[PDB]
Design an enzyme around this catalytic site. Sequence first.
Site, PDB file in Angstrom:
ATOM      1  N   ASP A   1       6.218  33.457 -30.272  1.00 29.39           N
ATOM      2  CA  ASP A   1       6.777  32.575 -29.250  1.00 29.39           C
ATOM      3  C   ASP A   1       7.806  33.396 -28.478  1.00 29.39           C
ATOM      4  OD1 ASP A   1       7.951  30.614 -27.674  1.00 29.39           O
ATOM      5  OD2 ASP A   1       7.856  29.084 -29.239  1.00 29.39           O
TER       6      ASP A   1
ATOM      7  N   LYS B   1      12.373  30.471 -18.257  1.00 24.51           N
ATOM      8  CA  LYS B   1      13.564  31.119 -18.790  1.00 24.51           C
ATOM      9  C   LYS B   1      13.751  32.492 -18.160  1.00 24.51           C
ATOM     10  CE  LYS B   1      13.563  28.650 -23.177  1.00 24.51           C
ATOM     11  NZ  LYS B   1      12.374  27.762 -23.270  1.00 24.51           N
TER      12      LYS B   1
ATOM     13  N   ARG C   1       9.013  25.096 -15.062  1.00 22.25           N
ATOM     14  CA  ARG C   1       8.941  24.552 -16.410  1.00 22.25           C
ATOM     15  C   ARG C   1       7.477  24.325 -16.759  1.00 22.25           C
ATOM     16  NH1 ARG C   1      14.447  23.582 -16.915  1.00 22.25           N
ATOM     17  NH2 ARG C   1      14.399  23.110 -19.159  1.00 22.25           N
TER      18      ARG C   1
HETATM   19  C1  LIG Z   1      11.797  30.025 -28.275  1.00 23.81           C
HETATM   20  C2  LIG Z   1      11.396  28.712 -27.608  1.00 23.81           C
HETATM   21  N1  LIG Z   1      10.094  28.363 -27.535  1.00 23.81           N
HETATM   22  C3  LIG Z   1       9.743  27.202 -26.943  1.00 23.81           C
HETATM   23  C4  LIG Z   1      10.715  26.373 -26.408  1.00 23.81           C
HETATM   24  C5  LIG Z   1      10.270  25.063 -25.760  1.00 23.81           C
HETATM   25  O1  LIG Z   1      10.556  24.991 -24.395  1.00 23.81           O
HETATM   26  P1  LIG Z   1      10.367  23.513 -23.683  1.00 23.81           P
HETATM   27  O2  LIG Z   1      11.719  22.901 -23.396  1.00 23.81           O
HETATM   28  O3  LIG Z   1       9.601  23.656 -22.393  1.00 23.81           O
HETATM   29  O4  LIG Z   1       9.605  22.590 -24.605  1.00 23.81           O
HETATM   30  C6  LIG Z   1      12.029  26.722 -26.486  1.00 23.81           C
HETATM   31  C7  LIG Z   1      13.130  25.829 -25.914  1.00 23.81           C
HETATM   32  N2  LIG Z   1      14.354  26.606 -25.810  1.00 23.81           N
HETATM   33  C8  LIG Z   1      15.512  25.729 -25.770  1.00 23.81           C
HETATM   34  C9  LIG Z   1      16.773  26.583 -25.903  1.00 23.81           C
HETATM   35  O5  LIG Z   1      16.708  27.727 -26.431  1.00 23.81           O
HETATM   36  O6  LIG Z   1      17.878  26.148 -25.488  1.00 23.81           O
HETATM   37  C10 LIG Z   1      12.375  27.887 -27.081  1.00 23.81           C
HETATM   38  O7  LIG Z   1      13.721  28.266 -27.168  1.00 23.81           O
END
Ligand SMILES: Cc1ncc(COP(=O)(O)O)c(CNCC(=O)O)c1O
Lengths: 461, 461, 461, 461
Positions: free
Chosen positions: B216, B245, B251
């Site tokens: 991931d 990100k 998104r």
């Molecule tokens: C490593 C990782 N993988 C998947 C997701 C899911 O993203 P969605 O919001 O689109 O579902 C996140 C969310 N990261 C949130 C954070 O680190 O603040 C994440 O940090």
Amino acid sequence: HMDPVSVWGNTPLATVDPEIHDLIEKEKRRQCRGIELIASENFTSFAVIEALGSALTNKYSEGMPGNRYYGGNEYIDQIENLCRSRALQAFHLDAQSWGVNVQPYSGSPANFAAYTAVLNPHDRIMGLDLRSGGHLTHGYYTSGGKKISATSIYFESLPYKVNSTTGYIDYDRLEEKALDFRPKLIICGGSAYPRDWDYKRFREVADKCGALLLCDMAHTSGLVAAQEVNSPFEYCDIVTTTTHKSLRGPRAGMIFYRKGPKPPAVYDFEDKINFAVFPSLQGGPHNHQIGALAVALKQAASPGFKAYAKQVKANAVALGKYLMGKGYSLVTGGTENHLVLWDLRPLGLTGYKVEKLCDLCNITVNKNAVFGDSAPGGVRIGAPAMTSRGLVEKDFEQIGEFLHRAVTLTLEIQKEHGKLLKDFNKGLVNNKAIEDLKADVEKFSALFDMPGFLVSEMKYK
Amino acid sequence: HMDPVSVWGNTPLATVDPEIHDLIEKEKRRQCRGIELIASENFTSFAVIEALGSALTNKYSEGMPGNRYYGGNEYIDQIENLCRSRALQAFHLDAQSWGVNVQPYSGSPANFAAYTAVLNPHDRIMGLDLRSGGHLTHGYYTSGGKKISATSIYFESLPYKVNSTTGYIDYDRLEEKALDFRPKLIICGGSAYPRDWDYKRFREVADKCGALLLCDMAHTSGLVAAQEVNSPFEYCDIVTTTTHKSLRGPRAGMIFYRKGPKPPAVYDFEDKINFAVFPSLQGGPHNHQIGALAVALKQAASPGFKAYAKQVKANAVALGKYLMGKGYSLVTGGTENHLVLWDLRPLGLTGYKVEKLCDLCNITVNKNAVFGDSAPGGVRIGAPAMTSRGLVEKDFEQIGEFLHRAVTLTLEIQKEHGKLLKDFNKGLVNNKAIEDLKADVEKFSALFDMPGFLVSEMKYK
Amino acid sequence: HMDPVSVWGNTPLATVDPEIHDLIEKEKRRQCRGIELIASENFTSFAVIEALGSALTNKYSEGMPGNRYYGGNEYIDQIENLCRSRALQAFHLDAQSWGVNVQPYSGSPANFAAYTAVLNPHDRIMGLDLRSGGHLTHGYYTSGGKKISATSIYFESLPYKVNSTTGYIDYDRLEEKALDFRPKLIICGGSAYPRDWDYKRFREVADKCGALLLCDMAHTSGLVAAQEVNSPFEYCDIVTTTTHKSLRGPRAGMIFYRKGPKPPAVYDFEDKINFAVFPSLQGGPHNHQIGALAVALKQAASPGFKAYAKQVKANAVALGKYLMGKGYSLVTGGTENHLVLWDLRPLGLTGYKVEKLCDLCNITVNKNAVFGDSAPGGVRIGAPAMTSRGLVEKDFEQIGEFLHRAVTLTLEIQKEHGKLLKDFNKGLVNNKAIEDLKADVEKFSALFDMPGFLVSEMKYK
Amino acid sequence: HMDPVSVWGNTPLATVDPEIHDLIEKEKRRQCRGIELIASENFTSFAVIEALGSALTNKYSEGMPGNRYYGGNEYIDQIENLCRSRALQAFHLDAQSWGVNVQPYSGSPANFAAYTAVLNPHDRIMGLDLRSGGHLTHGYYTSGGKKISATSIYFESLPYKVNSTTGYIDYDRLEEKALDFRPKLIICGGSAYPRDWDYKRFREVADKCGALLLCDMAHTSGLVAAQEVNSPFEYCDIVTTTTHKSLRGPRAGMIFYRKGPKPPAVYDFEDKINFAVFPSLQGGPHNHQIGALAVALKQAASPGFKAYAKQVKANAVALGKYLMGKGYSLVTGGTENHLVLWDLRPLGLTGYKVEKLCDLCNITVNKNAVFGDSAPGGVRIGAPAMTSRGLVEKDFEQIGEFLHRAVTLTLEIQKEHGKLLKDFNKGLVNNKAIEDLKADVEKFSALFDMPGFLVSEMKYK
Ligand SMILES: Cc1ncc(COP(=O)(O)O)c(CNCC(=O)O)c1O
Ligand SMILES: Cc1ncc(COP(=O)(O)O)c(CNCC(=O)O)c1O
Ligand SMILES: Cc1ncc(COP(=O)(O)O)c(CNCC(=O)O)c1O
Ligand SMILES: Cc1ncc(COP(=O)(O)O)c(CNCC(=O)O)c1O
């Protein structure tokens, strides 16, 4: 060397990505140069699109308003709270009895989030059979046992069907199944059912077998908001929906749930459903979707939208009466909502054959299963999309004339070439009779306005 | 009377919904009047926003390009195909060895779709522990056995942790767990891990225990695309990610999968993953997201983005070195990616205390668990957001100076009033030292440009 | 013509079925013409056998005493009530705090019935690893993921192991696993563990991770009844067991469960466990087994049995000291119960090789895994069977001499022929040195009495 | 001091345990001093009892003949192999097409072992509904959703019922359910169904829905062995059974499975079923049961048993015709096997009321549900038990006369006192008409011989 913010971040789309900009322009033309009759499609407002495409896509707001993990959600909370309070008033729901979660990314995530909240894995679910006009997320497996839908993968599903002659929901067979199968959740609502739902009867069945009652009002949410169809909130514990169909909003999902005291002890759906969406299943909410949805819910509560939903039913009825006046068969012999289901088996045709020739005339419909199928033998035709462009009964009767001509040309090709799909196709190449219908369709299509974008400024004709 | 299309469908947002328009404007000001350091946040391009907010939201295209249920997808297929080919070239993937599905609504749906494709219900999964810097969707349950994440509801999860003294991933403890627990899937990647990942070592563990290896790369997708960190595609079978990100897109989610002949017999992930996304879990794809994603993937493959990702790493390093030069402790004593993890336990502070005072100075960070926690004792600080606004090392060293002053004022308040939340809060009301930091923050924040929208045309100051 | 009752129903076995009668006679001779050292085997009393083979096998008594489905259970209820009241007093259990169900067909059904009562499907279980001396019904899957035991099929199991150098249970590693895995049930007890169990420490671990604590005392039930080992009833919630091992009864199972008020609120195991046995899992109870068990429980509560259990430990200790005095290695360097585990890896031998040659001398042992195995490298030797024939320390030291000679002849054959199993076997054909040991074994075996049947009337020598 | 082997191990039961010996003697008297009509009960031979109560209970033989974990199974393997070859020839099965496993501890373990072998957890099963005359282990849950049977706990069950007017199996409703529910296994056979089974029709249904077909012939195994009813081996893939009912053997279970080439590719049930019994579910086999079973299977293949099974059918028919000649109603109006199902609702009575008064006259029957129940309204009466004592049609017609008088006295008591259980019971105390029926029963019962034990040597009258 990094590109300055002006170059990469502020430059319009038409310069950064010519390909994608050009492709979006062609889609805009395709959307107004033809006749869109997909019952699940609509044309949303430019105001919804502006909120959809905004800086709201930059903010992470994991959690709920007032209980966020991160800071800086001063205005996201105001937007979401406004969105859920508008969602309740748009469906005439007392806040003391109903709550809503507007974070589901789409309708399919909304349904699976509702299941996770109230059910444990392998709990039994009953939903309308696909062939009878149901939806995948209500449960679907093939005749070989292949679990197609995730609802049938992580839960045990069993479908209830319509009467194989009338096309109406068999509520006596539904009660019989619910008492044998003992489902923990019963789902009402569908995608190609042309009649209203007896939610009071579903409540009696649910109470008899000790099941929760959920309604997936995705297709008829706009009609429910305008009170043009039966309200599931009067008898169901949970109501899920999309927001981009008859509701005419963005692509998103909502989960309505009962709150307060249970009827003749207090409901406890709120925390389970909120927790299922986050942190169980979803991450950060798509705030741009929620902003766009708040716009759509205010538009849905306006008197113009109630007239729109009333017009949608009148246009689907006028189209159905025109088709039956030409000798065509409709499932249940009419409609009480936004769509008609056209049984093409009495004509010796299949849905695919009519769908393919209609697509060549820029008439967008979808092949659909009809009760007693064995190769879908029907087509599903919806009114919301064209009704959003200002079409009324007279225009939809002209749409029936185009469909009449489309199936007439479909029969002439099957007569000349054959009932073999391979033989049928040979009759569509260079067929001049299709091209005269395509031209009458485009010319008829180009006589109406279009929401979402200004046709005067669009790049293509 | 129905409202004409011009009134409801073409009228701009500022007139249809003043409330939502006004709230979106304040969010725009909030996004550029402060310092955003949430490691999972970024500011996307106006070109992405234009594609995101387009007529692409009106089209139902259930299925795959060239294999759709409905007609009229001539240009949606071109947009999606362009999006998946750009996704492959953005990560330097040979099309004969890698495929991608760009329909996941978000990152969380992408992960659960990957699980459904390759695993059966209750199959065992291993992911980085939440307290060690992992993510919910990688598996999470509480100490009471309460299954928080859906990954731990429908599958059996067990987390691997970091070394409780160094803060690095304990690869020997990972191999030990994987050989006892025998998981069917091992997940690498995290949300608050400040170092790179030894994907080659994960492959050795996965091969030893006969597990699939998924990464991931959501947080570091931008760095992976620019080859500024280790590439998981060299050792993992499946790679999932968000796109909003470090990738600096909309998104959405993507699922990369291996195809073609297996290393020292052909991979069979393609059909399972595509089928899991649709029709198993999701409905119609959000075509506007895919169009916006296709724009972002072309921007991600540009030389400017490669410099951006290099700058993100340099800014996080410069910020970390500045904090350690003032005597502050960082997990692993540095960073190799986009974020630093700041251990606040040696100061007698909690993450919440620092986060709350930073929020009052318009410095957005998040409290975060640190290895050996028992009340998270750290804060997670990210570089992508401010780096997208043109900030370089000198600017991030000034951000560390603001954080230095913020925690200095947090200790002065704790000293005067106490470690009681009520007493701590009492030191933030009318505190003039905070207002001098907030004023120094806004004025520093307002010296940089902003992507997504033009500041010259915004409604608020 | 039907056969009269006298012909088919009253005729003795030796006339109705000569084959089976002759085969039973040879088994009777085999049981007394050799040296039986299987730690799970014993020779039950003729009184138990008479109750086992009685008219009690004709009665259907589904349910529990006083709550049967069928009538005519006037005496079955008295037999079962006597059996469970004897079961409680045999283990010094206050009826106000403990209940027992004596209907499990065997030990394996007893364990799975206990699991069904207190756990839902896929609930997590922890038990002693097979290689560390555990049992299948405590959970077992292979390194490839093949779920061997039903406990690992319908529940999620994870084994805790012994220290890989000392051979003792690693209670620190047990606590570490129980806190990561969070099992809903922890199982103590084993089949080849030569030491006692720290049930108080298992209670501390169970309480820490919020798990139920079950003990499978099948192997040491006789020692527990005579209070020659630690009592699991002082710290475990549920105690399951067989009755045909050290308890010296018939082949059956029992489930002990706590009743009354919980320690510093009342236990609710009784109804769940009774319901799991019937009607959930089992049908009619084997009343002949319950009658035979009631006999064995009265014999187990006699002073002679306490001396027997005390002798079993002394004989296993004397045998172990004799083997270690000859330079042989034992796991943990001794024993505290009924068996010794003989590590044969320091000799360059495998358990199979020694087991096969011992079987050719009518010395029955079983190959068994030893801590740190990779081909079991040890043999498990038990004392109950021969101790039931009146053997004391001097006789068991003579058994060690036979085992000493057996392994000495095993090494001479491996030296002459090789360490290849195929090569090893070639040294056992016509080997006159084995035949002199077989003869000393039979002659030594025939110097002791035998329970269950009278040797004076047996058909074979 | 240990007790010598002579004292504890060779002393007869009458001296070691006077209580249990005395209770077994009273059970022997109860078994021959009354009229046993439980359809699932029988009186086995003394030869079976002798093998059941033998030294065969001392041997651990985990595994299969020729593939045991432990040594010293030279004669256990011969006993088991003889048992499985006798099982095949007792049911006229070609060894190249059928295999059998004779290790199931009882019938309920045999069924669950068959499920584990061919099904995964939560696989769908269909069996005859309990109220329609099915068995618990075929699936049972209450109307509240409470999963009673373990088959419905670890698998998903759904029952098929009989026609609610004729009392026959509704094969059209069975096919309808099997095509909706799509079970992975269909179970035929029951406990209180008075007609034969159309296994050929079950095969058509199974083939149509792609399910395996299993038959639980427990009740009619004796009739199947003598070919007095339809053979399920001609159409079913797996056949499970008890051995202590109409087969007149010990309490045990067997699992028959198809092997060799499949009908218009080779069956693979053998290894799965053997592996499910051991090591998955069961531990060591009860060798004494297998020895007793081998004896019973040789007796089952004798011409006397073939006449016995023919007599059982004639006695149940003669009893049914006698009851219908007195105006009593039977489900389906007759019988084709060993039992009759007596509908007592037309009399204004319940099964319990008749069962209780029959129990006071030493007539053992069981209350049983009848098709269309809402408090079971029928009684199940079986012929095997009394037929094994030499009773023929004239004797069973006298049994009907006793049942006639029993229900006549039940109506006279209900008339005098009422339908209140307390009032009904009040009519049974000191009732001299019952004591005249009991006396007529015992004197009639004492005119016949008894298998299993010699009445001339019994301790009680
Ligand atoms: C490593 C990782 N993988 C998947 C997701 C899911 O993203 P969605 O919001 O689109 O579902 C996140 C969310 N990261 C949130 C954070 O680190 O603040 C994440 O940090
Ligand atoms: C009744 C219903 N409910 C939920 C959904 C899911 O919506 P999403 O595609 O946003 O996941 C659909 C999709 N309906 C698709 C169609 O009928 O054409 C639906 O028809
Ligand atoms: C058809 C059937 N199958 C299997 C079983 C299980 O037998 P066990 O008791 O050995 O588990 C029964 C029990 N028959 C009980 C009755 O009809 O009264 C049964 O009726
Ligand atoms: C500790 C333990 N518990 C339960 C059982 C099951 O007993 P049954 O075979 O009656 O199902 C066994 C079998 N022990 C077999 C051995 O060690 O040789 C056991 O060792």
